[PDB]
Paper text:
Homologous to both U2AF65 and the yeast Mud2p, the Poly(U)-binding splicing factor 60 kDa (PUF60) shares domain features with U2AF65 by also containing two central RRMs and a C-terminal UHM. The most noticeable differences of domain structure between PUF60 and U2AF65 include the lack of the RS domain in PUF60 and a highly extended linker connecting the second RRM and UHM in PUF60. Although both U2AF65 and PUF60 are general splicing factors, the PUF60/U2AF65 ratio in cells influences alternative splicing patterns, suggesting PUF60 is implicated in alternative splicing. PUF60 appears to promote splicing at a weak 3’ splice site.
(A) The structure of PUF60 RRMs in the absence of oligonucleotide was determined to 2.8 Å. A dimer is observed in the crystal structure, although the protein is monomeric in solution when unbound. (B) The dimer interface observed in the crystal structure of unbound PUF60 RRMs is fairly similar to that seen in the dAdML3’-bound structure, with Lys-201 from each subunit crossing each other to span the dimer interface, suggesting that the dAdML3’ takes advantage of an inherent capability of the protein to dimerize, so that the higher oligomeric state is induced in solution in the presence of the oligonucleotide. ssDimerization of unbound PUF60 RRMs is not observed in solution, and therefore must be due to high concentration of protein in the crystal. The similarity of the dimeric interface of the unbound protein to that found when the protein is bound to dAdML3’ indicates that the propensity for dimerization is inherent in the protein before it encounters nucleic acid, and the nucleic acid enhances this propensity to dimerize such that dimerization can occur at lower protein concentration in the presence of nucleic acid. None of the residues in the dimeric interface are close enough for hydrogen bonding, except for the amide nitrogen of each Val-202 donating a hydrogen bond to the carbonyl oxygen of Val-202 of the opposite subunit. However, in the unbound PUF60 RRMs structure, most of the residues in the dimeric interface are not close enough to hydrogen bond. Although the dimerization is unrealized at normal protein concentration, the interaction of uracil in the oligonucleotide with Lys-201 adds one more hydrogen bond, which would make dimer formation more energetically favorable. However, in the absence of nucleotide, PUF60 RRMs does not dimerize, and neither does PUF60 RRMs+UHM.
Author numbering: 99 to 145, 148 to 178, 182 to 275, 277 to 294
């Protein structure tokens, strides 16, 4: 896949269809509900009877997030149906290419991480499951503070599995959202 194609596959893989949305709910509600999985980049909710259509397309900044929201979102809110944009099929080959590639790094995604924790803490907390090759938390450029999520590459596959199975929904005051990475480190490259 070309640098551009991979950049377009990642974009689609971060989109999640949300349906059965009560008519009295707006993007702010949806946003808050899915935020646990990674900061929400944008929301595309389609609205002469200015009310909407109870479906939205939430777009995360990284596909790993979309992957988790889909696995953990089957809550009420007014019930809702989660799925994927029916056009991913056009980027499926690459998406599969990114999947195959991802399996070479015992890479894991970690969302909903408290502002006070740092790359160290997270590292500290996670190395308990195995030697950690890399441990970094995404950060805001204009600030520098982590965006509440990051990635952790383990030395051993077993280590990343133990980490995942043990930390998904781990406390404190919030619940961490963890799951295996669905993409390699530099997706647009090769």
């Amino acid at each position: 896949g070309s640098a551009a194609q991979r950049q377009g596959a990642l974009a689609i893989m971060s989109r999640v269809y949300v349906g059965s949305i009560y008519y009295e709910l707006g993007e702010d509600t949806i946003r808050q509900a899915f935020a646990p999985f990674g900061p929400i980049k944008s929301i595309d909710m389609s609205w002469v009877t200015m009310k909407h259509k109870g479906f939205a397309f939430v777009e995360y900044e990284v596909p790993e997030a979309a992957q988790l929201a889909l696995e953990q979102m089957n809550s009420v809110m007014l019930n809702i149906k989660v799925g994927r944009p029916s056009n991913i099929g056009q980027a499926q080959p690459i998406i599969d290419q990114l999947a195959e590639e991802a399996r070479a790094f015992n890479r894991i995604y970690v969302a909903s991480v408290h502002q006070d924790l740092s790359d160290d803490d997270i590292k500290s907390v996670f190395e308990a499951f195995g030697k950690i090759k890399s441990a970094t938390l995404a950060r805001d450029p204009t600030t520098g503070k982590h965006k509440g999520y990051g990635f952790i590459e383990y030395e051993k596959a077993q280590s990343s599995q133990d980490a995942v199975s043990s930390m998904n929904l781990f406390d404190l005051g919030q619940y961490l959202r963890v799951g295996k990475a669905v993409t390699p480190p530099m997706p647009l490259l090769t």
